[PDB]
Amino acid sequence: VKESSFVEKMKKTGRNIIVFYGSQTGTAEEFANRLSKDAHRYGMRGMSADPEEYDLADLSSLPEIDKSLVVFCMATYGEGDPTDNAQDFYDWLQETDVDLTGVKFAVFGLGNKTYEHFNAMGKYVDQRLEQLGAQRIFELGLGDDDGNLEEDFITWREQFWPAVCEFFGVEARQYELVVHEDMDVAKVYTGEMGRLKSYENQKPPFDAKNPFLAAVTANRKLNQGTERHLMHLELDISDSKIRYESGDHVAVYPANDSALVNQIGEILGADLDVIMSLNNLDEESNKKHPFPCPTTYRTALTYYLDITNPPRTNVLYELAQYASEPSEQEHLHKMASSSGEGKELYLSWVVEARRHILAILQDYPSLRPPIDHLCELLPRLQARYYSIASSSKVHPNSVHICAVAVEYEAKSGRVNKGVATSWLRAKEPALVPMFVRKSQFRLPFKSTTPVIMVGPGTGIAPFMGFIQERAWLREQGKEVGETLLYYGCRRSDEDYLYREELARFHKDGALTQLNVAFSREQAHKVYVQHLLKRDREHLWKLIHEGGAHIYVCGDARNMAKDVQNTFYDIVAEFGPMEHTQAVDYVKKLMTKGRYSLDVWS
Ligand SMILES: Cc1cc2nc3c(=O)[nH]c(=O)nc-3n(C[C@H](O)[C@H](O)[C@H](O)COP(=O)(O)OP(=O)(O)OC[C@H]3O[C@@H](n4cnc5c(N)ncnc54)[C@H](O)[C@@H]3O)c2cc1C
Ligand SMILES: Cc1cc2nc3c(=O)[nH]c(=O)nc-3n(C[C@H](O)[C@H](O)[C@H](O)COP(=O)(O)O)c2cc1C
């Protein structure tokens, strides 16, 4: 059920600039919001909208508004596909014939070079609209998350507005605090995501808005060493009605470290246990609150807000008014610079030093902002995803998670800890709000199809699922093909994940070949690519004659692309080909669903 034409919403609300956002983990939204807040005191007036709830065909009616401009802040996910919320826009856009002549636009893509289809989504919207007759007002920004998406945006945004002012010639808070002294507690959100008492009155089906509360059945340390901590949790989804398959992902809604929460209240001299509400007061908007209200400051900072990731430019700039010392006040105002020492200090003192909000406050004694303004500026705490480590056919009422607990010492001088991983780490077998989202990472249909799994480190997660299901089919008497696991870890006795289980699978015929590279047991580093190169001739027979499927799960920055280069080589060698010939052959494998990835950062 979608909303009424945004064109009418604009005409009725006196706005001319509308900014849609294709976002998954809320970054494109954070930008869309900042951009539509720029116009407000730059001559014009805009609004950020979710394309998933509007009919984008109404773009043709956009030019009915004088000086109209539409901006798209799109993120690309997977294999250059759109984000969930931008899916319907994508497909409409893809095969529509609506003449958008008169429509003015500007697009900002959010991507990451470590992936192949860099800003594939952004580039599409940009090229497409123009083909439909619309005119580009400003060049397509191509932000890169590998470097610094924040600085790419600050830069584009810096040239965008001046361009919008020339063409159009104009030449030129967001929330209210309502403390609720008198109010029943059963009307206060205690950190569910959907409706009130949803974590209590649990009703299927469960999803992003209505996450199920699975209780931790098991939580064991897979880690045999001590240097790191790798864990294995078994979540119970007994009567959730939830359906999952090997290769699917499971999101989890974490809770900020309470200790960090109480300190923010302390240093800021704020009472956290204050039932309150931040009403968006532009009375005519469907975005009434920044996060579920009414609720306390404590509940907000703990389940709804992001208090760990380094702050972005806009929040540092707004809090600058709260610095009593001019010296510090100016540093906050300068970190917003797209160049110069202000830009230098941001990347060093914040991004690189991994200074979260609390740190900034401790390292800048002047900063004593109001907690309500802080809760407005702070981005929302997102859910972390984990490749399911079990098979629905052997564990239908349980979702297994394999994860390495993040924790390191930052240049800020403080020990930072992973939000979800610390959380999950402490979950003594204790509910966990989760949901499940389908992927394309799947085993082949014909059990006879051989599979080559390359998963070093925690990238073995989805493979425990594939292996359980692969052995299960063998119990059914079905004819299973070769199942090869190319795993990798540091030292045999430090972090060999599922050593015992894998061994059991190998001898039971389930796991055809258990190939493990121990990168630190010798002087030279042995990696899974070396084992791949070692078995090149056989690998080629499977890939070339058996129609084998390859699955590379894990690190996206290095491992994934290194493994690709090896397959390019194996191909270029066993079927006489020049380099370039082999790369197209391999990419053609990805086209037919023969080479599947499940990488991250
Ligand atoms: C599709 C998908 C599947 C995933 N599957 C798995 C999985 O199976 N197993 C698994 O463990 N993870 C997996 N992840 C990663 C997982 O979602 C989380 O990123 C991870 O669990 C850490 O989250 P966190 O909340 O603990 O840490 P956060 O609080 O989010 O902190 C993480 C951030 O800290 C920074 N960082 C980390 N170490 C350092 C350092 N030493 N120096 C500087 N900066 C640093 C980086 O910004 C990193 O993203 C997956 C991600 C995706 C997209
Ligand atoms: C699983 C995953 C897949 C991604 N796939 C791509 C991709 O195909 N191409 C690209 O340019 N960026 C890709 N990215 C990067 C995101 O687009 C980038 O982080 C962006 O800032 C996300 O914005 P959001 O927070 O609005 O989703 C991917 C990120 C993840 C985690």
Radius of gyration of the chain (CA): 26
Instruction: Find out whether 384 is annotated in a ligand binding site.
Output: yes
> Where do the domains of the chain lie?
1-172, 201-254+381-441, 255-380, 442-601
Distance between CA atoms of residues 127 and 135, nearest Å = 10
Instruction: Find out whether 174 is annotated in a ligand binding site.
Output: no
**Span from the CA of 354 to the centroid of ligand 1 (angstroms):** 14
Q: Count Cβ atoms below 10 Å from residue 442 Cβ, excluding itself.
A: 17
Are 510 and 475 a contacting pair, CB within 8 Å?
Answer: no
Distance between CA atoms of residues 167 and 421, nearest Å = 49
Quote the tokens at residue 598.
């499940």
User: Nearest 10 degrees: CA dihedral of 111, 114, 115, 121?
Assistant: 20
Distance between CA atoms of residues 594 and 590, nearest Å = 5
Distance between CA atoms of residues 399 and 7, nearest Å = 44
Ligand 2 atom nearest the C-alpha of 382 is: 25
CATH code given to domain 1-172: 3.40.50.360
Distance between CA atoms of residues 298 and 265, nearest Å = 8
Residue 329: phi and psi, rounded to 5, are -55, -45
222 in helix, strand or coil? coil
- H-type alpha helices, 102-235: 120-131, 149-168
Q: Considering Cα of 98, then 101, then 103, then 108, what sign does the dihedral take? A: positive
**Span from the CA of 260 to the centroid of ligand 1 (angstroms):** 19
Say which residues have a Cβ less than 8 Å from residue 124's Cβ, sequence separation at least 6. Answer: 90, 93
Q: Which residues pair with 298 in a beta bridge?
A: none
Ligand 2 proximity of 536 Cβ (cutoff 6 Å):
no
128 in helix, strand or coil? helix
For the chain, report the end-to-end CA distance as a whole number of angstroms: 35
**Span from the CA of 238 to the centroid of ligand 2 (angstroms):** 32
Instruction: Find out whether 115 is annotated in a ligand binding site.
Output: yes
Q: Exposed, middle or buried: residue 59 (CB in 10 Å: 0-12, 13-18, 19+)?
A: buried
- H-type alpha helices, 45-86: none
Distance between CA atoms of residues 50 and 22, nearest Å = 7
Say which residues have a Cβ less than 8 Å from residue 553's Cβ, sequence separation at least 6. Answer: 387, 441, 453, 454, 455, 459, 460, 461, 462, 463, 597, 598, 599
Ligand 2 proximity of 50 Cβ (cutoff 6 Å):
no
Q: Give residues preceding each break in the chain, C–N over 2.5 A.
A: 172, 429
Question: Closest Cα to residue 376, out of 276, 281, 310, 291?
Answer: 291
Say which residues have a Cβ less than 8 Å from residue 559's Cβ, sequence separation at least 6. Answer: 456, 457, 459, 527, 528, 552, 599
- H-type alpha helices, 394-452: 419-426
Catalytic sites, residue numbers = 387, 553, 598, 600
Domain 255-380 has CATH 3.30.70.580: no
CATH classification number, 442-601, choose in 3.40.50.80, 1.20.120.1690, 3.40.640.10, 1.10.3720.10: 3.40.50.80
**Span from the CA of 80 to the centroid of ligand 2 (angstroms):** 9
461-475 and 499-507 are packed helices; what angle lies between their axes, rounded to 10 degrees?
30
Question: Which ligand is located closest to the Cα atom of residue 598?
Answer: 1
Q: Which residues pair with 73 in a beta bridge?
A: 21, 108
Ligand 2 atom nearest the C-alpha of 24 is: 27
Q: Which CATH architecture has domain 201-254+381-441?
A: Beta Barrel (2.40)
Quoted resolution (Å):
2.6
Ligand 1 proximity of 219 Cβ (cutoff 6 Å):
no
267 in helix, strand or coil? helix
HSE-up (13 A, CA, CB side) for residue 158 = 12
Residue 486: phi and psi, rounded to 5, are -100, 90
Tokens 């014909």 belong to 446
Q: Count Cβ atoms below 10 Å from residue 186 Cβ, excluding itself.
A: 9
Burial track 471-494 (b if 16+ CB lie within 10 A, e otherwise): bebbeeeeebbbbbbbbbbbeeeb
Q: Exposed, middle or buried: residue 372 (CB in 10 Å: 0-12, 13-18, 19+)?
A: buried
Residue 242: phi and psi, rounded to 5, are -65, 135
Distance between CA atoms of residues 265 and 375, nearest Å = 12
Distance between CA atoms of residues 136 and 124, nearest Å = 13
Count the helix, strand and coil residues of the chain and give each as a percent rounded to the nearest 5.
35, 20, 45
Question: Closest Cα to residue 74, out of 154, 162, 2, 142?
Answer: 142
Per DSSP, which regions of 93-241 are E strands?
104-111, 135-136, 141-144, 176-177, 212-221, 230-236
Q: Which residues pair with 81 in a beta bridge?
A: 77
DSSP class of 585:
H
Ligand 1 proximity of 600 Cβ (cutoff 6 Å):
yes
Are 47 and 15 a contacting pair, CB within 8 Å?
Answer: yes
Say which residues have a Cβ less than 8 Å from residue 328's Cβ, sequence separation at least 6. Answer: 364, 365, 366, 367
Residue 82: phi and psi, rounded to 5, are -75, 170
Ligand 1 proximity of 308 Cβ (cutoff 6 Å):
yes
Distance between CA atoms of residues 155 and 143, nearest Å = 10
CA–CA distances in Å: residue 4 to residues 16, 48, 99, 298:
17, 15, 21, 36
The region that residue 599 occupies, defined by phi over 0 for left and psi between -120 and 50 for alpha, beta otherwise, is beta
Amino acid letter, 342: G
Q: Which helix or strand (DSSP H or E) is residue 530 part of?
A: helix 528-534
DSSP class of 85:
G
Question: Do 1-172 and 442-601 agree at the fold level?
Answer: yes
